[PDB]
Amino acid sequence: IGTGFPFDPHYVEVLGERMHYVDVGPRDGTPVLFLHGNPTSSYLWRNIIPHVAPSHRCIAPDLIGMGKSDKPDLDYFFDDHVRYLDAFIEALGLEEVVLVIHDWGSALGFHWAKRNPERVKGIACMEFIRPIPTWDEWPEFARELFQAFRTADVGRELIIDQNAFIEQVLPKFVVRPLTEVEMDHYREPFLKPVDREPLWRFPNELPIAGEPANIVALVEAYMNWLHQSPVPKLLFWGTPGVLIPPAEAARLAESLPNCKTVDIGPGLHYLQEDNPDLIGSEIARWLPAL
């Protein structure tokens, strides 16, 4: 598994802030837009993109306040990310797209898809955000941790002061051991504690136990759209998973229209770090059929 990030940097100005993105592959057909989540960046996609780039344009932005993108003094609510991503897509003059999405990147992607259904040609997804009705549906191996993340004072102490989302959550949710080089790549955006605001707000935006109500409503909305959309879908899952356990992937395999599922083997949350070659190769095999 490659530790390097051999991609020329690109920046586009979005609402007075520069957003970094990877942009490789041929420029004529439909682009594949890769959307990371918390606490990652386009670095998450580094070993997946090379399978896809030979045949298709790969665009992978770093979300505002993350990766190599500018870091405005925002609250970094989900709605903030929505506004910047909406503006990024229009800034590049993208028409139709294929989405490849994960975690908060999936919330963003699905919400964009619901609002622009005519412009989405396919969705490849993995460990995506769905309503979590109770904490019983959250893996026992991370229940107290994320409960603490959403507790007053304690949450900020763990995520901001101690950098728990980088130093604990990342290794905890990758089955194979991450190298020091890989950790340093993930560390680089958040060397300054103050810049960890998005890493704390994201877990506090998760639709868990009916709160926050607005996000629950929004996620329910795009899941309702997804369940009745004819757009081709490719769902990657792992055992035992985090957001999408095997049993959930099985239900989605039946319920989601026009959906193919791919079992990546052992996986938690950052499936891209466990089996990037299978994820990349399957996306590549899938795209020409769109």
From Swiss-Prot:
Pfam families, per database record: Abhydrolase_1 (PF00561)
Catalytic reactions of this protein: 1-haloalkane + H2O = a halide anion + a primary alcohol + H(+)
Induction: By 1-haloalkanes.
Keyword Glycosyltransferase found: no
SUPFAM superfamilies per UniProt: alpha/beta-Hydrolases
Record flagged with keyword Coiled coil: no
Active-site residues, Swiss-Prot/TrEMBL: D103, E127, H269
EC numbers: 3.8.1.5
Sequence ranges assigned to domain AB hydrolase-1 in this UniProt record: 31-155
Record-level GO BP terms: response to toxic substance
GO molecular function term, any single one: haloalkane dehalogenase activity
Cellular component, GO, one term: membrane
Keywords: Detoxification, Hydrolase, Plasmid
Listed pathway(s): Xenobiotic degradation; haloalkane degradation
Sequence similarity: Belongs to the haloalkane dehalogenase family. Type 2 subfamily.
Oligomeric and partner information: Monomer.
HAMAP family assigned: Haloalk_dehal_type2 (MF_01231)
Function: Catalyzes hydrolytic cleavage of carbon-halogen bonds in halogenated aliphatic compounds, leading to the formation of the corresponding primary alcohols, halide ions and protons. Expresses halogenase activity against 1-chloroalkanes of chain length C3 to C10, and also shows a very weak activity with 1,2-dichloroethane.
Protein name: Haloalkane dehalogenase
Native organism: Rhodococcus rhodochrous
Lineage summary: Bacteria, Bacillati, Actinomycetota, Actinomycetes, Mycobacteriales
Gene: dhaA
